[PDB]
RNA sequence: GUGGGAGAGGGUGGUGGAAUUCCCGGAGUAGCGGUGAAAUGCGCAGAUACCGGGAGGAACGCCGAUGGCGAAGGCAGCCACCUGGUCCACCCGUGACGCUGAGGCGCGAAAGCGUGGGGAGCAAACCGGAUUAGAUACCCGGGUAGUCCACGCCCUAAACGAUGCGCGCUAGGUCUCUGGGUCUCCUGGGGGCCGAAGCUAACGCGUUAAGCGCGCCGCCUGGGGAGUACGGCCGCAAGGC
């Protein structure tokens, strides 16, 4: 049910369309380089849709990873 | 005449002279396509999330400019000829969309 | 695209009177500008059909407006055709 | 005879066979084992017990090179992955980290008919 | 018209990473693969597994959904350019300029055809291995056209909501997309579920009508024969109407 914490509630004022801010977009990624779903981010439809393309831009720039490796399995 | 943002990631192993020459070529190409610069933010070398050109780091440059649209792509090609320049991304400027306000 | 300055230019050029923004002549002139722009866009990129359909719809709308003008006042109809250079 | 004393261990586990390859921290292999290395020949290679035997055999072969600490790397979803994990975990070799690095594509190539109804 | 809005709507160019295959090198040894179980196959000319580098083609993981867009087919990495449709607010302009639509014309998944190119993966036909009473199959190892691209044809479908288009009227509740606003909520457009009246043979439909009405087009008149024959038109052919 993802009752741990919401990324939006665990954050303050920030720009969703900013693709250069890495320390904020790192929080929206999972343990892997995948994009967190709606239940983890706690965003809306439009917010999630903008976040998707901004994360893709940050990945192409080389700031966010396309994929990572799971640890402690 | 639209407003754009240019992100240029190049080799962080360049010395000051080679970096100065690369930035000189960048400014010269911007003048050759009529790109009026409004501001600039040079973040320096930063750690990449994945190796680009066999290098775990990259030197970043950002330019907010205003230029005619018809040659925007035609400018991007000119910035990809330099072997030191390894990433060029041009994005139309957009107003910030703030969340949790 | 079509900026606001060109739109206001053609509107004030084909306005029946200062303030008129929706008369038949203004609509036909705007449709003609859009049609010429789309034809110049479709000379190249000739594989685009979804915009070709919009071109067909604009042509039909302009033809219907010109038919209405022909029915009501043929003088302004001939004047509009002479100013825009339509019908070949 | 290299005396590595610290390396990595790749475990390629499939529904038909599980193979363990012990390499150096740079990826170059030293020794390895699988279900075919053990007396098992046919389908018995896709067995968790066979995977345990292969892991222990590769571990004992790595003992010849005097290796103590390992970094396990897991690839592929097959019967016997966790059994090989538990075999290498208590085999004299110190397991420092377990990493699942199964290569997942971004829907690039078309799979076989056996793996169709997907992309 | 003015000012705003959202979108995998379309076309062109460029560009990103993961993966598969192949090649080069390093390291390394007795099998890998595959199945209910096996064999063909590949491996001492050193495979499989591992690391690094290179090439190439094709498709875009998470986001992603019961979601969005389009007239339908259909559209899913990213960036730029060109471009279509659409919604809302203001009540601003024209002043019935509207609806439908036989023909005509254009678009039209996949497969197929022509020319040229491309060809990694997949894979009709086919070459084999198994299975079986037999296996011209399901299973397994290979593999051509093709899938891909450009241009030109082909007009088919479970082309499906099995529900033609437009307008008006007729209880609501709830979920959601997207605006606007006095932003508990109201209002507009779109996508779902449950249901008033009502309809239906029933299942079910029910402000996204299959309800109540109106306008216009298409089509049906028992089944097989048969979407066959003949004729005509179109098509290089396959064939289609
Ligand atoms: K053999
Ligand atoms: K849908
Ligand atoms: K050929
Ligand atoms: K609102
Ligand atoms: Mg370069
Ligand atoms: Mg096996
Ligand atoms: Mg699009
Ligand atoms: Mg080799
Ligand atoms: Mg083989
Ligand atoms: Mg082979
Ligand atoms: Mg042999
Ligand atoms: Mg030999
Ligand atoms: Mg291989
Ligand atoms: Mg490699
Ligand atoms: Mg090739
Ligand atoms: Mg999905
Ligand atoms: Mg729609
Ligand atoms: Mg469909
Ligand atoms: Mg009025
Ligand atoms: Mg009046
Ligand atoms: Mg119509
Ligand atoms: Mg018709
Ligand atoms: Mg077709
Ligand atoms: Mg086709
Ligand atoms: Mg062909
Ligand atoms: Mg060919
Ligand atoms: Mg094959
Ligand atoms: Mg086959
Ligand atoms: Mg056979
Ligand atoms: Mg039988
Ligand atoms: Mg027999
Ligand atoms: Mg081949
Ligand atoms: Mg042929
Ligand atoms: Mg359907
Ligand atoms: Mg229908
Ligand atoms: Mg029927
Ligand atoms: Mg509604
Ligand atoms: Mg119901
Ligand atoms: Mg009733
Ligand atoms: Mg009932
Ligand atoms: Mg309807
Ligand atoms: Mg109705
Ligand atoms: Mg009869
Ligand atoms: Mg019949
Ligand atoms: Mg009949
Ligand atoms: Mg037929
Ligand atoms: Mg026929
Ligand atoms: Mg005939
Ligand atoms: Mg003929
Ligand atoms: Mg035939
Ligand atoms: Mg035939």
Swiss-Prot record, chain A:
Gene Ontology terms: cellular component: ribonucleoprotein complex; ribosome
Keyword Ribonucleoprotein belongs to the record: yes
Q: Does the keyword RNA-binding apply?
A: yes
Protein origin, superkingdom: Bacteria
- What terms describe the molecular function in GO for this protein? small ribosomal subunit rRNA binding; structural constituent of ribosome
The family classification in the record reads: Belongs to the bacterial ribosomal protein bS18 family.
Q: What does this protein do?
A: Located on the back of the platform of the 30S subunit where it stabilizes the close packing of several RNA helices of the 16S rRNA. Forms part of the Shine-Dalgarno cleft in the 70S ribosome, where it probably interacts with the Shine-Dalgarno helix.
Q: What is this protein called?
A: Small ribosomal subunit protein bS18
* Biological source species: Thermus thermophilus (strain ATCC 27634 / DSM 579 / HB8)
Lineage of this protein's species?
Answer: Bacteria, Thermotogati, Deinococcota, Deinococci, Thermales
Which gene carries the instructions for this protein?
Answer: rpsR
Within the intact protein, the region shown is 16 to 88 of 88
Curated annotation (Swiss-Prot), chain B:
Question: What keywords tag this UniProt record?
Answer: Ribonucleoprotein, Ribosomal protein, RNA-binding, rRNA-binding
Q: Which residues form a coiled coil?
A: none
Matches recorded under InterPro entries = Ribosomal_bS6, Ribosomal_bS6_CS, Ribosomal_bS6_sf, Ribosomal_S6_plastid/chlpt, Transl_elong_EF1B/ribsomal_bS6
Q: A Gene Ontology biological process annotation?
A: translation
Recorded GO cellular component terms are:
cytoplasm; ribonucleoprotein complex; ribosome
For this protein, the record's PROSITE patterns field holds:
RIBOSOMAL_S6 (PS01048)
| GO MF annotations in UniProt | small ribosomal subunit rRNA binding; structural constituent of ribosome
Could you name the domain of life of the organism this protein comes from?
Bacteria
Protein purpose: Located on the outer edge of the platform on the body of the 30S subunit.
Entry similarity comment: Belongs to the bacterial ribosomal protein bS6 family.
Subunit note: Part of the 30S ribosomal subunit. Forms a tight heterodimer with protein bS18. May make transient contacts with protein uL2 of the 50S subunit during translation.
Spell out the protein name for this chain. Answer: Small ribosomal subunit protein bS6
Swiss-Prot record, chain C:
Is ATP-binding tagged as a keyword?
Answer: no
**A Pfam family assignment:** Ribosomal_S15
Question: What is one GO cellular-component annotation here?
Answer: cytosolic small ribosomal subunit
Cross-referenced SMART domains: Ribosomal_S15
Instruction: Tell whether Ribosomal protein is among the UniProt keywords.
Output: yes
Going by the UniProt record, its keywords in alphabetical order are: Ribonucleoprotein, Ribosomal protein, RNA-binding, rRNA-binding
GO biological process terms held by the UniProt record: translation
Single Gene Ontology MF annotation: rRNA binding
The subunit field of the Swiss-Prot or TrEMBL record says:
Part of the 30S ribosomal subunit. Forms a bridge to the 50S subunit in the 70S ribosome, contacting the 23S rRNA.
Family statement drawn from the similarity comment of this UniProt entry: Belongs to the universal ribosomal protein uS15 family.
Record's function text: One of the primary rRNA binding proteins, it binds directly to 16S rRNA where it helps nucleate assembly of the platform of the 30S subunit by binding and bridging several RNA helices of the 16S rRNA.
Write the protein's name: Small ribosomal subunit protein uS15
Q: Which organism is it from?
A: Thermus thermophilus (strain ATCC 27634 / DSM 579 / HB8)
* Source lineage: Bacteria, Thermotogati, Deinococcota, Deinococci, Thermales
Swiss-Prot record, chain D:
Question: Which residue stretches belong to region Disordered?
Answer: 99-119
Could you confirm whether the keyword Secreted appears in this record? no
The GO biological-process annotations, alphabetized, read as:
translation
**Compositional bias of type Basic residues: which residue ranges?**
109-119
A Pfam family per the record = Ribosomal_S11
For this UniProt record, the keywords arranged alphabetically read as follows: Ribonucleoprotein, Ribosomal protein, RNA-binding, rRNA-binding
UniProt record similarity statement: Belongs to the universal ribosomal protein uS11 family.
Q: Please state what the protein is called.
A: Small ribosomal subunit protein uS11
Organism for this UniProt entry:
Thermus thermophilus (strain ATCC 27634 / DSM 579 / HB8)
- Please state the gene responsible for encoding this protein: rpsK
